[PDB]
Design a binder for this molecule. Structure first.
Ligand SMILES: NCc1c[nH]c2nc(N)[nH]c(=O)c12
Ligand SMILES: [Mg+2]
Lengths: 219, 51, 51, 313, 79, 182, 221
RNA sequence: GCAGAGGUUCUAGCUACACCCUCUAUAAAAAACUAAGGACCACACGA
């Protein structure tokens, strides 16, 4: 009466380090959606990350106003800044801003990883600088926050991208075990920024929900 | 000679139900509220012998 | 199944697209009036549940 | 007896009743892919009974064919596993009662379902001209390797994207998915999340699920569209385009080859038909099939999330 | 599993011809003891034959050459 | 209502209604589950109890699809007019498991199977359970004479009578048909 | 991070009670509410009749003298019967009432392990003083919904579909908590309309467990 | 049925397309083998 089929992770296919498609064959009737919905919201809006997009404006009076001498629009740089994953810094607060720039596309590598910044993708390009002499924008996102916080709620303000998983999809199909009533089979597709592996992100989300249910474990 | 819509609105007003006839609804699976409140009410339903 | 704020799950979910072409707009009026009648019935039941 | 519909030549010679055939009412079951369909468990056991008997004999579970007949009556778990193997790659013809056009009979890969009703993939329902008002489809099982190969090569629904009458997609989305996409691919002057800048369509989907931005709010989001201008080569172009969040989300469904202009409109019914036609013309048939299936899934999901409802007010 | 035969129709232009050539290969695979050249991913013989056409392992000309080679092998067996 | 039962209802008529001689009661034998012309069930359910004053022309017992004297063809059921994941695609209808759990739309179907013993050549068919080469479980449902016991649940393909080919002709439940023998 | 507690469990009525989870953070509350509602509605332990043997009738589709309702009507009434059992999984309850008056769940013989939540509930009406009713109703615990056909000896025993779900209607309301030290916290209030057989706090804790063991699969070994 | 004869069984079982086994005067030791009479007309309903 308390024994329910316990899901087993039959496959954890990783199309890319960022993209994984974990699937559990058994689960229970109408449980795959429940576990999937719970997991989706917890990683999407409650998994903490260290990317504070808002950084100090340099050489621009307004975020909408565009700095001259850089091919990319200021808004295009802001979108790239949101993209940089930045691995969790040991210090929670944002502490790093470096604007060093060179002619052509300027990558995240120039900002560098002072202390625990640990930029996930040096290859990712922050902006394209038309002038070699001009050094501007860049800066580093290092404040820990939970989920996505918009610019309106939270110098230069950018909508925060703290959430590690860029997009997650949960799909349910009915699969019977041997000869039995069909039971929900849930496949979760997770694309991560790159701070953590998608499978590791699933593990982190499960522990976070378990802590909420920790008080009511029936001893 | 049946009820006009105004009479149905008044009868709804008699209950706690909104007079608009649209009640905010939430998805059973996700638990997220549907936009544009849906129409909910009891309609007589018949099962036909063509089982 | 979808559930309203009170938590009562709707038993039958119907495609609303049959209403425009097959102009049986009465079924929408039927649904609204049924909701009103059940609202009356629910208030009566709540009065009856308590003393 | 010789002449007329009563007459044998019309009565039987022209149309002969067939074995391995069955009828049942139709059911939607959107979860199915376009190529596959839903087949009742009990109906399949009767339809594929000779194949089941043969597989049991090859397995050695049934020493004799009389024993195999008894096992099918018993309906033991072993018989159901044997049915799954036979059902895996034997295409089943699905025929609407009035076969006005060739699309009326289309083969599908059968999928075992608990219910007693055949399920037809929703996109092909428009092709059949069938509804779910208790419509009944005859289901036939091709037997020979020639028959199965013919079914998979030509009879299968994926092959007949375009109607024979006109070079237009006959799998055009019909009722619910089009409404869901139209709600998705719509613009509002003011809604929560308006004016934001989004890293990509993935971020648009994440914002929508978070609920911070509605489906139909306009945002400035980059789109990486691949262009097939180089014959057989995809040239990636990334640009900031002023579009709604919903259209950004749907862009993930669209393959890389198609341009972003097609999604940027309202995407009604003629619009989605033109989208499918362009997909078939530019990309291969298989990308077109995947695109159509993804369209149907996304449209149903976002129509359900939309909560479209008809009321007196 | 091949749910789309468009690549196979590229290999055999007639498409109707593709059913016939695939049928001969599939018959050889099932009734005859012929190894599937394409790896079998839990696939029925008809799908394996279609996969072989898509691979280009089997074509109408190739099937004819293999049948002729088998006829020569039968003469060698006769000795 | 002098006495009420599911089988029958007894009304004691008022003296003014009562004729002077040989009168004073009206007995209505309600028809229980009977095979309908369309294989449904005609069930007469009493709607009154003891002591209830019943006026002339009042409905003593509801018939099939009748509720307190009102025609009740079906069930008033909760309806939500929304497109839900495509399950209701063209005109399809979703229904909650709650409806099945409450047996809201469950219907009794009465199927009448007739086995006829005939004066065949080489002797007549024998209705007695003399049939050989049959399962013991099938014979157990049958009585000594071969007729199935009243109220015995049977499944498609199970034997119901004991007709024997004169020297295997016994009527069996049609496949996909099941239920008690009323 | 913060962890919720059942700070308040109020029994506004015997049938339905409200359960409060105060220390819930933003977003967590809505997720927990939806997941708890789904897991409670889907699968909770419960007690319902599964087999009834009226002494005097052979099959459900028949009448019994002196009984106003049909035998099938009796089974339909008994299907929605409020029963709790603790101890052994299955128990047989015997009903024997004679004479006029409608029989109730109170008329059933009382056993130590089983106590009826709703004695006032009506089974059938005995309309004859001479007539009497005798039955043995068998109650076992299960999950979800089990149709009568799916289950499974003599002709006397009648199979009745089992609805083991004790909860009928469940709603969760998420509103901002009254804590002042840290804002944005939202308390979760869950109201469970139940048949009365299941304890509210126990049901919530059991559902939380079932979710936890189902969730324990995701974390790596 | 090696030809004749008998045959376990898993209705009946050298032909229905049939098939196999053992045995030498007649049945008895053994496993593998296989699909049944439904005509016409009205009414009603569903697509
Ligand atoms: N149809 C032939 C036949 C009748 N009885 C049989 N018994 C056995 N062992 N073998 C058979 O071949 C036969
Ligand atoms: Mg139709």
């Amino acid at each position: 009466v308390t024994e329910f089929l316990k899901p087993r992770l039959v496959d954890i296919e990783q199309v890319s380090s960022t993209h994984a498609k974990v699937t559990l064959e058994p689960l229970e009737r109408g449980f795959g959606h429940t576990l999937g919905n719970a997991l989706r919201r917890i990683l999407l809006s409650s998994m903490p990350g260290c990317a504070v997009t808002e950084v100090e404006i340099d050489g621009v009076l307004h975020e909408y106003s565009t700095k001259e001498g850089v091919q990319e629009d200021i808004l295009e740089i802001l979108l790239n800044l949101k993209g940089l994953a930045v691995r969790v810094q040991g210090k929670d607060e944002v502490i790093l801003t470096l604007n060093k720039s060179g002619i052509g596309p300027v990558t995240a590598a120039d900002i560098t990883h002072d202390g625990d910044v640990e930029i996930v993708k040096p290859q990712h390009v922050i902006c394209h600088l038309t002038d070699e002499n001009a050094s501007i924008s860049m800066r580093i996102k290092v404040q820990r926050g939970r989920g996505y916080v918009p610019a309106s709620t939270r110098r230069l303000l950018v909508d925060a991208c703290y959430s590690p998983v860029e997009r997650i999809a949960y799909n349910v199909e009915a699969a019977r075990v041997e000869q039995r009533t069909d039971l929900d089979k849930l496949v979760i597709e997770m694309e991560t920024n790159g701070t953590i592996d998608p499978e590791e992100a699933i593990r982190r989300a499960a522990t976070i929900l378990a802590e909420q249910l920790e008080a009511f474990v029936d001893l | 000679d049946g009820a006009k819509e105004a009479e149905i609105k008044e009868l709804l007003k008699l209950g706690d139900l909104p007079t608009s006839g649209q009640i905010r609804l939430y998805d059973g699976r996700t638990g997220e509220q549907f936009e544009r409140p849906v129409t909910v009410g009891y309609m007589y339903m018949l099962k036909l012998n063509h089982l | 199944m979808p559930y309203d704020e009170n938590g009562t799950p709707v038993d039958i979910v119907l495609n609303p697209l049959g209403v425009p072409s097959r102009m049986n707009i009465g079924q929408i009026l039927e649904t609204h009036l049924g909701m009103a009648a059940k609202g009356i019935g629910d208030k009566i039941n709540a009065m009856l549940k308590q003393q | 007896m010789i002449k007329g519909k009563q007459g044998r030549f019309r009565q039987n010679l022209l149309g002969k009743r067939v074995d391995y055939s069955g009828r049942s009412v139709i059911t939607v079951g959107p979860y199915l892919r376009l190529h596959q369909c839903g087949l009742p468990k009990k109906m399949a056991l009767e339809l594929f009974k000779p194949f089941i008997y043969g597989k049991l004999e090859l397995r050695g579970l049934a020493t004799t064919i009389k024993a195999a007949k008894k096992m099918v009556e018993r309906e033991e778990a072993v018989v159901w596993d044997i049915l799954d193997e036979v059902i895996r790659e034997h295409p089943v013809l699905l025929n609407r009662a009035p076969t006005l056009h060739r699309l009326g009979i289309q083969a599908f890969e059968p999928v075992l379902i608990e219910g007693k009703a055949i399920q037809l993939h929703p996109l092909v329902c428009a092709a059949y001209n069938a509804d779910f008002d208790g419509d009944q489809m005859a289901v036939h099982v091709p037997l020979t390797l020639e028959a199965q190969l013919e079914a998979r090569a030509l009879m299968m629904s994926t092959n007949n994207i375009l109607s024979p009458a006109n070079g237009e997609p006959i799998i055009v989305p019909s009722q619910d998915v089009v409404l869901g996409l139209y709600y998705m691919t719509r613009d509002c002057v003011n809604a929560k999340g308006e004016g934001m800048v989004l890293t990509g369509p993935k971020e648009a989907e994440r914002l929508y699920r978070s609920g911070l931005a509605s489906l139909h709010a306009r945002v400035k989001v980059r789109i990486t569209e691949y262009e097939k201008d180089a014959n057989g080569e995809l040239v990636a172009k990334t640009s900031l385009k002023d579009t709604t969040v919903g259209r950004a989300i749907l862009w993930m469904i669209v393959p890389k080859g198609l341009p972003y202009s097609i999604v940027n409109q309202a995407l009604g019914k003629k619009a989605i038909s033109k989208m499918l036609n362009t997909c078939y013309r530019i990309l291969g048939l298989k990308p077109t099939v995947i695109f159509a299936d993804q369209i149907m899934y996304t449209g149903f999901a976002y129509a359900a999330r939309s909560g479209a409802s008809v009321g007196i007010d | 599993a091949r749910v789309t035969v468009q690549d196979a129709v590229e290999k055999i232009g007639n498409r109707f011809d593709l059913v016939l050539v695939a049928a001969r290969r599939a018959r050889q695979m099932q009734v005859g003891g012929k190894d599937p050249l394409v790896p079998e991913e839990n696939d029925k013989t008809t799908v394996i034959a279609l996969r072989e056409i898509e691979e280009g392992l089997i074509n109408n000309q190739i099937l004819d050459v293999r049948e002729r080679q088998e006829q020569q092998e039968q003469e060698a067996a006769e000795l | 209502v002098q006495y009420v039962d599911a089988s029958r209802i007894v009304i004691k008529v008022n003296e003014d209604e009562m004729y002077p001689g040989e009168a004073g009661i009206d007995i209505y034998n309600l028809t229980k589950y009977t095979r309908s012309n369309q294989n449904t069930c005609i069930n007469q359910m009493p709607c009154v109890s003891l002591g209830e004053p019943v006026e002339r022309g009042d409905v003593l017992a509801d018939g099939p699809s009748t509720d307190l004297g009102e025609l009740a063809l079906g069930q008033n059921m909760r309806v939500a007019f929304m497109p839900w994941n495509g399950y209701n695609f063209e005109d399809s209808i979703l229904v909650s498991e709650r409806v099945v759990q409450e047996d809201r739309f469950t219907t009794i179907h009465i199927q009448e199977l007739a086995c006829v013993s005939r004066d065949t050549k080489l002797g007549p068919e024998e209705i007695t359970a003399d049939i050989p080469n049959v399962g013991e479980a099938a014979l157990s449902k049958l009585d000594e004479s071969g007729i199935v016991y009243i109220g015995a649940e049977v499944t498609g393909g199970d034997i119901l009578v004991g007709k024997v080919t004169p020297k295997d002709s016994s009527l069996r439940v049609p496949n996909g048909v099941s239920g008690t023998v009323i």
